[PDB]
């Protein structure tokens, strides 16, 4: 309803309510957020019912309101708006309204399958499902400035409505206003950082586990219409980073591990067929590369074998190691390296970004050629890294087989209950303290190999009294227990040495 | 549909997706979260589609998953669940399902009007509106263990469905399971902390402003059905903390400020009539106390006059000062203190919690009686604080009038645009650097008293080169500009000295 819509906007203005503490995981819900196609700016209109929560003042630019993309590149990462009085619409073209609920987001690299899944698809899947209804109603708006890219078919599976690119918005009018828009992508599913500040590596406190990956994987499998069976799957590339003796590799793996081997590639199968093959594979063998993000479709119990060309240290490039080894993935991971320069083929004459080093270096071409290992570096330009990563590789088959052969629950306790303490007296003036409790309520439903309890004693005033680990639900303390004194006592239960349960309410004990 | 519901739960288990980084502002969306009325515990069932995002491991108990209440009391603050295998339902009573979408939350003190509005109503209003549909569909479940309390009529205005208390859940069955539940209250509207760790005071970085308070205020006014006119409103108490010369106070204020004065109290008017009176008042006069949270209903331009009894320092008790002075509230705030012991009446013989000090103190009753000012203290027991705060007060009218008489926008710039730099040469070998830019896009729509620009220069390598504040959009740097050198240049625009806009993309300049 155009007149009512324009009136609500011109008089009331924009409304914004956001989750989160800082820009790193603020997600915002907007009503009447506008966008100028000429200025390429989002606009917050101040009207007489406008709401801006949080109201950050100058901190809104330190560095930005929120993160549009999960990749912390300090560039396409950031979202902000500019402020105008709602009354300024009197001097502006009449706006075009977007009635769909929108999710606005930026893609870091839509042409790379790892970036697509890890930076965009998994975050979109769970960001959408944070908010009721978005998953079945939202239209994605990708604002970063890229076109469709090689995997647009995959982005389409995430929104029910056809996504729109920034270029297509210029055709809709000079001033667009969103009646209902969400802005921001959660980083909660991320596990890797690409090396902008320190060398690339896993993130420090990963909050995603196998069950969360698998729920996403099942969703993609159904949207791809692909929901005896022991085989090894070799995920080849056809353009660069080749396995030069692939046919001999396939035969040796089949004979050694005694099961059929099959090849797959992105270039010669539909993605649905890729997912179909990965999803029932017992082993996935592949050169390091973006196709290994399909590891997230493997069945429980499978093995990932990642091959690295000459001079490339597997411990420096662990996005698929990190994924394969997440808690609950139930995969095994094997890295194998080519250490034999006779088994590598370099390509020093290719375009600089496909590995070439003739592009322009003096005696630097000679440092690279003679370096036995690519040193730690930062994103994203390093010449030596691209030179070595785009080598082709002849796999030393006995070394690979021996390497593979060498390299082959979790519920936490509740609080203990009804904890109590009793002081007692013995000898002449000697004090004792007995502490007892009942097992956690959930323990009767579990089958746990080792159950222990940890008791912390503190004389009211100073530090703690060395925790005591016990198997029983009662213990009498004698040493360092003095009469006429108050002790605070805490108890927690521990499953299998490492699953630390919560502490109960502190007990105050008087001797 | 009971069999389908039970099957989805027993096979798939619980799903959880949460916003936020830490327990302080994590809000969680659950499907199939259950609750045992006997154990008084929430239950996460692990099934073969269970999702727990974030998966915190042991950090889920450091200290808790999320905060059920906005008051950081380390007690009713915390929410957690205990984990069970979904298969354990074979050995459990059949669950009762809750079909309504639920918002689960804890109230810190439902009997105190300040705690009700600041801890519960405002956070509920915006937490509900973070998520589409909750505002018109959710049923509140208050789990803290209190009954209805004196302001239950107000909590009812926030959910469209009748809220439920924990006591009423025990009557519904042994095991309840929520098909759709949100858990957590945002702290984003809070402005005060009640002194559990350091003495009570405003919070350090308040993110709520007048427009956000007012949107909430308008909503309450409509749900209360209450949406010439210059008058002063005296908000009296009838039970304790009395103004002993109220009638003389009313007459003196009316004659001095030349407008009608009116009284109001919680005890003798309906809350809707209270809101009706506060909402058009030009001045609100009241003893310090919970009734002053109605400050948030005042019209723009009004004045709050808060009276403090003998020995109570206004600077130590600022919840209504802080509220009145929030950016965008457009209120004035006056605190007045009784410094005259002849004008105070103490009540040393009342119950300890209504001010009494005979309850039990030796020569401590004498320290309190002779102390000229209540010292800084922590929540919530302090004897001297309760003794002084429950005094009655005769107001010294000339002192109050003189005190009142003595004590009587904000849009930020966009980025500058098209910033460029040119190196130039002068004398023999002397280098100059000229920098220019266009004004921010939003500036043409504003009326700003002072517009300046701040330019930061850095010789690539060391720190910055003292920012230069300029009024023009171009400037030539001469001193400390060396040839054969690279300078990074940043520019931001500043409105009225304190509204700092964002920096544009850095300029790289070569001399
Ligand atoms: O022979 C090739 C080389 C690349 N790619 C795909 O093209 C994209 C870009 O490859 P690039 O080498 O840049 O990334 P990488 O594999 O190093 O992550 C990725 O999605 C690869 O899976 C492919 O399908 N075949
Ligand atoms: O004479 C009185 C005293 C208190 N109250 C209300 O009773 C509650 C508890 O008052 P208390 O003194 O405990 O809190 P305070 O006013 O100090 O915040 C608050 O909502 C007060 O507004 C009231 O209506 N009349
Ligand atoms: C804003 O203006 C419109 C009409 O101009 C009016 O309906 C609405 O109540 C106004 N709100 C305020 C807070 O002034
Ligand atoms: C879980 O079990 C049910 C039936 O027992 C089945 O429909 C569903 O596909 C199972 N999911 C997995 C991941 O095993």
UniProtKB/Swiss-Prot annotation, chains A, B:
Pfam families per record: Glyco_transf_61 (PF04577)
Keywords (A to Z) from UniProt: Congenital muscular dystrophy, Disease variant, Dystroglycanopathy, Endoplasmic reticulum, Glycoprotein, Glycosyltransferase, Limb-girdle muscular dystrophy, Lissencephaly, Membrane, Signal-anchor, Transferase, Transmembrane, Transmembrane helix
A single Gene Ontology CC term: endoplasmic reticulum membrane
Effect annotated for changing residue 114 to T: In MDDGC8; no effect on protein expression; unchanged localization to the endoplasmic reticulum; decreased protein O-GlcNAc transferase catalytic activity
Coiled coil: none
PROSITE patterns named among the record's database cross-references: FN3 (PS50853)
KW Transmembrane helix (keyword) present: yes
Glycan-modified residues: 48, 225
Residue span(s) of domain Fibronectin type-III: 419-511
Pathway given in the UniProt record: Protein modification; protein glycosylation
Stretches assigned to the Lumenal side: 1-511
Catalytic activity reported: 3-O-(alpha-D-mannosyl)-L-threonyl-[protein] + UDP-N-acetyl-alpha-D-glucosamine = 3-O-(N-acetyl-beta-D-glucosaminyl-(1->4)-alpha-D-mannosyl)-L-threonyl-[protein] + UDP + H(+)
Top-rank EC class of the record's enzyme: transferase
Compartments where located: Endoplasmic reticulum membrane
Tissue: Highly expressed in the brain, muscle, heart, and kidney in both fetus and adult. In the brain, highest expression in the cortex and cerebellum. Highly expressed in the pancreas.
Disease with which this protein is associated in UniProt: Muscular dystrophy-dystroglycanopathy congenital with brain and eye anomalies A8: An autosomal recessive disorder characterized by congenital muscular dystrophy associated with cobblestone lissencephaly and other brain anomalies, eye malformations, profound intellectual disability, and death usually in the first years of life. Included diseases are the more severe Walker-Warburg syndrome and the slightly less severe muscle-eye-brain disease.
Function, in words: O-linked mannose beta-1,4-N-acetylglucosaminyltransferase that transfers UDP-N-acetyl-D-glucosamine to the 4-position of the mannose to generate N-acetyl-D-glucosamine-beta-1,4-O-D-mannosylprotein. Involved in the biosynthesis of the phosphorylated O-mannosyl trisaccharide (N-acetylgalactosamine-beta-3-N-acetylglucosamine-beta-4-(phosphate-6-)mannose), a carbohydrate structure present in alpha-dystroglycan (DAG1), which is required for binding laminin G-like domain-containing extracellular proteins with high affinity.
Protein name: Protein O-linked-mannose beta-1,4-N-acetylglucosaminyltransferase 2
